[PDB]
Design a protein around this ligand. Structure first.
Ligand SMILES: Nc1ncnc2c1ncn2[C@@H]1O[C@H](COP(=O)(O)OP(=O)(O)O)[C@@H](O)[C@H]1O
Ligand SMILES: Nc1ncnc2c1ncn2[C@@H]1O[C@H](COP(=O)(O)OP(=O)(O)O)[C@@H](O)[C@H]1O
Ligand SMILES: Nc1ncnc2c1ncn2[C@@H]1O[C@H](COP(=O)(O)OP(=O)(O)O)[C@@H](O)[C@H]1O
Ligand SMILES: [Cl-]
Ligand SMILES: [Cl-]
Ligand SMILES: [Cl-]
Ligand SMILES: [Cl-]
Ligand SMILES: [Cl-]
Ligand SMILES: [Cl-]
Ligand SMILES: [Cl-]
Ligand SMILES: [Cl-]
Ligand SMILES: [Cl-]
Ligand SMILES: [Cl-]
Ligand SMILES: [Cl-]
Ligand SMILES: [Cl-]
Ligand SMILES: [Mg+2]
Ligand SMILES: [Mg+2]
Ligand SMILES: [Mg+2]
Lengths: 156, 154, 154, 154, 156, 156
């Protein structure tokens, strides 16, 4: 199955700037399905867990202050090769490097002690699975049809 | 006290058509704050609690089927006179009657045995209170600053 | 029978300014279905047939010149109460009078010897029938499903 | 003489929130012409001249603080009945009262000790004249063709 | 003359999803001129003719079912180097590979038995001429000025 | 300081086509700050000064006629690495080559005797300084906070 799920976090800079809907519309427009979503306020413990791979890096602390600065919207996107697709849609990590057309390329630039880059997107299928489990319980993820789902069915 | 909170439900028809982001952006652009939000799939019991006032109407059952058809996004919006403002933004109950510019006016039209109208909005501060308590726990509602909040203070 | 068809003409002024896509998207977003559509250049004879009701008005000639000025896009839209809905979406005949949110309200203003107002919309089911027969053959009108058609059925 | 000019001020609240381009595009899309425009920071003396009619109102001081809070974009728009049209596009003075579709309706809501409403628009041809003379010299206003100007001539 | 014409087909997935206007707006915004356009329902015979170059390929049949699934909107775009430009605007054949900013990059992803990719765009000047002739008669293509045409005239 | 200022000129083709607001919105959306802006009608003398580096090139004259054809909107953009960022946002000099997503990629294509390309963007920090000084007096450039400025402050 080419169908997979990735985790997206609309970071504090996007929420504060009122970019939630515009970010969501890009995924819906692409044809990606939102199977799970909710606004939460990430606490230090969960933040460090999500970014446990950066535990031993200089910028770590700035990154924690950042993702926990205000509530965020975490969501699970479902679709064909969603992980690489959503990663492509996100753009380069540093928004100034992200190309015009991507989420970071159009909405990101300014930074604090952390490289504020609009959203988070699972980098691999493996990370996707770990991160989705860290923010969502099975009961929060749903299976339902989007309008055009019928159109793509593999013949008879 | 002009700042109030209202409960909005992005109904199954909007979720299916991929209109969640567009509806949300209208509120963010208005200056309204999202203090709570989550995708959930409402069951008949909860749906009937939310729509209690319509239990004696002919269209009740079709309304419950409709609101429970697929997942929805329930959210709480905060801002100056949020309740009447969101209701103003929503438009007439029957999409064909909603004026261009409103959410129901621009996105709604087609119906089933229920009058599909994109979103739900609390009709009073009292109703919003009741509706928010049905879908959220205080721990799911947040107090934080939006970018321009400082511009209006003092 | 709430499903009806209406004839819309994206007038020369909209075609020239590159507003075809924006006008079409408003209908698609409303939930209306495009069952027919083609770019054509109307000649005086056909233009006068379409505008028969105005043959005795002072602005008739300028209206024919206007509608035949450049190519236009004629199209048929299908949906619940399509006729009154599209008319609602269009707005007042004179763009300066059309409310913000409507197509004439947002895109129209400037005029010539004719009141240039972006698009034309049938004013009744009877008129739509007549107007569609003027521009299309049954073979140019289609019956097919739009993505969310299933959501409203049964 | 239907072509007129009106003075619009994109107020501090719109400049701060990054709404300058969106407000301008609404006018360009309507068919209105920008014949003058510049970002400036109004001082109390000039602000009070612009708002002379309100010197005896309770909210005067807060209005001057507001309009002089940060830089603004003052601009002159030209077009058929520009004054009433822009006022129509702006919407009710109090954003909560402005209808969806209007600039104040879509972008305004929150207030301070002043009713923050995104933009200012001359209320008459006479007022526009006065207001334009306050912010521009004839050398800052231009006469040039917009892309579709030819479509409406002759 | 740098001015040329290419054929664009807003495939069934775009029509069904209500993306006709948004696709048209991108070309109009670019400055391209629509000289011909119409909604038709492509029959097997015409579809196989249009895609006669893929006649001897595996995916052929899936492609035919696809382009003939529902009505489509065929249109002729005119403008400076329109063929390469419109091809660039379209994005990579498989939507998941198309870059954010292109038509396939923003609107395409999911596939059926066919690689559903929003629109069709002539790949060469030669193909453009053959395809335009296959869908449009000379009487359906017009010559008229767009608003800003006067602005680009080559001095006196 | 990563913070810098670049000069942008919304050329005559953009003004005539009513693209001023859409071009401005892209920079505001990116997070760039407009510290100076005004509509002017560039005279030959100032135009040749701005493009003094192309004085000894063939296309020079066409370029002058172009930028002075109608009023333009000149503005000063402020933000982190604004010069390279705005240059990236602009796209390739010839609009047909600019990628979908950039300003020239989405709005530019047709040309006159000059390669009409929507806007001008300082190519270097050095050019930025010379050009900004050529169109703006210190009194026309302001320092004020944008809504989200507080969010990016470097911790305590
Ligand atoms: N007459 C009706 N027939 C079928 N469904 C209806 C009817 N009236 C309302 N509905 C549905 O029930 C919902 C709630 O009804 P009501 O509260 O009266 O409208 P509103 O959502 O504007 O407050 C409506 O939004 C619509 O989804
Ligand atoms: N008084 C007028 N002077 C010039 N042109 C007019 C006038 N009234 C209407 N028109 C033009 O004739 C068209 C058809 O007229 P009418 O059917 O009355 O308006 P509508 O298009 O809203 O149904 C109008 O859309 C406009 O293009
Ligand atoms: N009652 C009020 N209290 C505070 N501020 C107000 C009040 N009324 C108006 N204002 C502010 O003063 C501005 C000018 O007032 P007025 O001219 O009456 O409204 P308008 O801008 O719609 O012409 C309003 O746009 C708003 O910014
Ligand atoms: Cl990138
Ligand atoms: Cl869908
Ligand atoms: Cl309404
Ligand atoms: Cl804000
Ligand atoms: Cl109206
Ligand atoms: Cl649909
Ligand atoms: Cl209003
Ligand atoms: Cl124009
Ligand atoms: Cl690509
Ligand atoms: Cl044009
Ligand atoms: Cl580029
Ligand atoms: Cl900001
Ligand atoms: Mg109710
Ligand atoms: Mg009529
Ligand atoms: Mg006033």
């Amino acid at each position: 199955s080419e169908t997979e799920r990735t985790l997206v976090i609309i970071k504090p800079d996007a929420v504060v700037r009122g970019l939630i809907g515009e970010i969501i519309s890009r995924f819906e427009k692409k044809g990606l399905k939102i199977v799970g979503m909710k606004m939460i306020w990430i606490d230090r413990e969960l933040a460090e867990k999500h970014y446990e791979e950066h535990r031993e890096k200089p910028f770590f602390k700035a990154l924690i202050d950042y993702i926990t600065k205000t509530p965020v919207v975490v969501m699970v996107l479902e679709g064909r090769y969603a992980v690489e697709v959503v990663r492509k849609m996100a753009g380069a990590t540093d928004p100034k490097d992200a190309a015009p057309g991507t989420i970071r390329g159009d909405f990101g630039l300014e930074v604090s002690d952390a490289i504020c880059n609009v959203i988070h997107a699972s980098d691999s299928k493996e990370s996707a699975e770990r991160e989705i489990s860290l923010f969502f319980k099975p009961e929060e993820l749903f299976e339902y049809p989007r309008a055009a789902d019928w159109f793509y069915k593999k013949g008879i």
